[PDB]
Amino acid sequence: ADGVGSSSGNWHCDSTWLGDRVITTSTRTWALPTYNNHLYKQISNGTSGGSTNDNTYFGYSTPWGYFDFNRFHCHFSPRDWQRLINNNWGFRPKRLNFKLFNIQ
Amino acid sequence: ADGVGSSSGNWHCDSTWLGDRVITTSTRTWALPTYNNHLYKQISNGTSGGSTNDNTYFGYSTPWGYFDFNRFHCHFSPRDWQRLINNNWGFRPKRLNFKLFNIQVKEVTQNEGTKTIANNLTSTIQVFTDSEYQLPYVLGSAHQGCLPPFPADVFMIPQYGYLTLNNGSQAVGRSSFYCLEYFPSQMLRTGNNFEFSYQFEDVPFHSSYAHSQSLDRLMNPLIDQYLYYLSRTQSTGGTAGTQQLLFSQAGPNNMSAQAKNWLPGPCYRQQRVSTTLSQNNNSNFAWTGATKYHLNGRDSLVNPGVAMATHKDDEERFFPSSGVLMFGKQGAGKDNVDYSSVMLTSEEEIKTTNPVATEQYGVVADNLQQQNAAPIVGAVNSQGALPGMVWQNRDVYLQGPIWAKIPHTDGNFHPSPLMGGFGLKHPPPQILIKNTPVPADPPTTFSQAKLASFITQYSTGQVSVEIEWELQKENSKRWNPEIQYTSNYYKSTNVDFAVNTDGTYSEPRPIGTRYLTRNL
Amino acid sequence: ADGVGSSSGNWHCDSTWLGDRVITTSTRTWALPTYNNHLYKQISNGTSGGSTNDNTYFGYSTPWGYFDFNRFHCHFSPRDWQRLINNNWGFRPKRLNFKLFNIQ
Amino acid sequence: ADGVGSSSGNWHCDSTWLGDRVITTSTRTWALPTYNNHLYKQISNGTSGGSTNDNTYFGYSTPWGYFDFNRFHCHFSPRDWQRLINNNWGFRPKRLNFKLFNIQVKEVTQNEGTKTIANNLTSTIQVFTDSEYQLPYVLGSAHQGCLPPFPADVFMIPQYGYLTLNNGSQAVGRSSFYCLEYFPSQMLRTGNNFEFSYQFEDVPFHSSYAHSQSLDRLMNPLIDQYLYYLSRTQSTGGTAGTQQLLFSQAGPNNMSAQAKNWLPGPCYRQQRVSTTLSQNNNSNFAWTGATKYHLNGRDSLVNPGVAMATHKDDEERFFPSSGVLMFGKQGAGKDNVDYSSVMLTSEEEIKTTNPVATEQYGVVADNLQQQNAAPIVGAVNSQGALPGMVWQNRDVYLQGPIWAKIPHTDGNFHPSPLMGGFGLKHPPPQILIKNTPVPADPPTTFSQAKLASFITQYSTGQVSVEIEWELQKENSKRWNPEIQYTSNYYKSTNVDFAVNTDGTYSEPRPIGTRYLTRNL
Ligand SMILES: OC[C@H]1O[C@@H](O)[C@H](O)[C@@H](O)[C@H]1O
Ligand SMILES: OC[C@H]1O[C@@H](O)[C@H](O)[C@@H](O)[C@H]1O
């Protein structure tokens, strides 16, 4: 069972090269602050200031944060990238699996 | 189930002597700090400074720490070592079992000048083993930081770093960088425990015994040999010295001339240093007159060197300069400490099969004789392996290393460590451990820069390592009593191998493993 | 059945990379002359001539010829050698198969 | 069993018309020489000579030859082509079958001035196919060397070479070298035969038909549209021209103003050249005024270009400079041959859905109007694809290529060849063939140098290629008679599509595939 005195999961970083599949995995440690003092806030930029008409926007900034893994260097070491680009014509993602654990 | 209020495991220290097995176990308490503020750091030393070309290095120092149990005194009490070396010809490890348990993790903070420490229940630690030997193997270099010899001491886990190819202080193209967070590891909170098992690959018994016969004396003292040797090349007793070839059978009278099947082990000479000071030369020859090997433009002192007898008969005072292992007495400084502080080990017992470290291997001819030219025989300082050659490995000690990792290479010759030990192609996996970093409060506005501010933290806990040793029982028909390792009978200020008035454990002398005799 | 009007075998050159095996094959065209007019001949070199004592030999030269494939470049294209040395720590031969065919 | 005295296969030429399938087959006799004296040779052309930067290349010419059947006239007699184009809307290939048989191999020698040729029974040939498309695919570039149109001719197999990345005449790092002996191939003596089967990937029917409606006339001529357009921006009939917006429904009166769902196909303009000479300008604009595309610093003429109508109504004499395929009449020189020798193909039938090659695609506005500024409308010379746009592919011809290989790339837009044909991602494998070299007598003393002296040799034999075509039958309610392809009724000096007095077969005119009509 879960508790304050038992870890939620384990650290994992690997590249498993098997046949035509390569399974890359990465684990990181993150810190999530409190944004906007827990407020949604209208944010906007008008042409009234030094801004031009091209740079104007209207939107909202939330308290919520989000994870972005969308860059390759997250999932590949420079060596794992070298095996990839040297030996292979093409690659495409199949499936991903995502985990939060060990929350302080 | 695990929890903050239940212990992970139990304390165990024993030696279980059963038949041909002895299972030794040890438990210690450790404290693992935070190294490098959770940073990998290039470290290097160039010749630009006062350093020479020999002392240059390039490498990385990690945050990770590691356990080193590689010394014998970790697994044996001085009494358990005495049962071992007195009653047994040989021993080799079979399997080991290793445990982390009872993990406390504590955050320490500074307020003005006062320090305070408090449990952090939710913090973790990361522990993996390299089973596939995919890391620089840092054990077997005889570094400090082993579990204490005495079970009541708490020890500090050493930092893990490694060295890589260099040119000067600069790195070459084949230099490798290993990120240790890139392995799978297990993360443990205060209720979790870590364990794994390991099984040693079959390895020849360390031979603990001395030969009761020297190598050249294997002959029968009573009987002559049917072989002949060339005794005299010149006419004897005649008024003219006209040469004539005369032959003789060797016998009890001249044994040095008999034909022999075997030759002493290989010889790579050392410089001779006398403990009596007035005998040694006046100069500093320690580095200059040293026996060195030259590898890639760097002269590396040869230490301890190939196994070779320390000194010949009735010379106690001489020892090879780099030839012998040297252990310090308790509380010995690290720099230019006097002779009285170190404990010099000595090999008496390999004099039979091995040459003396400080003397020539032998003598060979330098020329082809003629009626005109006299024969000239040169000395052999260095001798590699020859067919029909036998030698003994260096003796293991209670303070010395247990094993070393045989490098992975195309070829090797008699792969046994020169420090003594068990050469292993797949030694016990080295166990890496680190405190998982906990960030200090991040800013309220996002910034890409990585978080450099962490909570000061350290973890403590209990570690158990249990090795199963296989014994080779002594079976011998010797009539007269053996030499044994015995503690001193006469009174002493304080007991040997025991704590002093102030609580400091100390080992008085190095204890070699070979008191028993065999026939060569 | 064999005959003057049917080929004995087929041309084959490949490198088949499968798992931990690589099967390399090579086919060449050879021409075998008639040596020594079908004679065994003593051949020797003495120190009598300008030769020194180190260069002297005694032996026989036969009519027979022989095949030597013993060099790597016979069995690997420079690309097949590149796949080999870049991706792999070690290699050792397992078995070979050898053929003469299409004899004119 | 095979042997020197039994034939490998039989002659076959037919067209089997059954239902929706037509199986056409052809057999020819070929002669394959020895190219490059059995050598691979770097070939290149630099700008150092009179060449320009556009004409530079780097590549290799091999000994290997190859079969090219890629032209229609190989697989169809002019009558079989007439049944096809008259009775059928569309056709696409299904599968082909290919055979080598009846192989003679002959060695020729020179003695003084007299030549003699004699069978070599033991010599072989090497034939492989690239099934996996691991070679430069040299077919589809409309090179010469196809099987003759007329079955009685013997043809010479063309040499195989390929081009690779270059910078000037020099080769860059990504330049590839392909050794063709490095594939598995089959070696055939005079009794052996070679065969393989191939099955075309599903491909849209080539559309052989013309539209009976222009694209803009799809409207009902009787009825008005309920939509309105802006007819007049100015007050009409008044003494003052003060602007007023006035709207109107388009109808039979003004059709050009109606709202339409679809737009003509894309336009990339060509220069207009008139067959009547006095109308064309006096200068050489052929290269200078040409429509070119600029790729990697090299200007490459756009030929034939995107499918676009040759000329508009009641202009016969104008044709786009590079826009049309151009075939030569029998016995036409390769350099600066007069207009009367070439046969210009023309697209009449795509005028409905496609823009004229020599005129603008349309007109768009160049400015935002104001009371101060007058509206200015610019011409659109080049127009890419827009939504709601329809076009016809270029018409295949009896002399033209059947297919081309769709390059392997991340993306393509409507991958159909601009020469016309069937774009295929995996076209028929190109078949390579070579004479296995036979050495001339080697020296009697060994020498490492490769053997440069070979027996002069060549091989001949029979080749059969059989393609199964799928037909799309014409089903139409049209009342009045179609246009058909008909041979001339009036008397002639010699029959069209038949041999002349001297034995030379000739094709009088290119025969386009679309005589039938459909509704657009
Ligand atoms: O000056 C004596 C010193 O010489 C150096 O070359 C060496 O690094 C030291 O170990 C010591 O031998
Ligand atoms: O001088 C006219 C020539 O100009 C060159 O640039 C071109 O290679 C030729 O095709 C021809 O156009």
From TrEMBL, chains B, D:
The keyword ATP-binding does not apply. The keyword Cell membrane does not apply. It is found in: Virion. GO terms for cellular component: T=1 icosahedral viral capsid. Keywords: Capsid protein, T=1 icosahedral capsid protein, Virion. GO terms for molecular function: structural molecule activity. Beta-D-galactose binds at residue 55. Residues 1-492 form the Coat protein VP1/VP2 Parvovirus domain. Its main location: virion. It comes from the Viruses. Belongs to the parvoviridae capsid protein family. This is Capsid protein VP1. It comes from Adeno-associated virus. The chain holds residues 219 to 738 of 738 of the full protein.
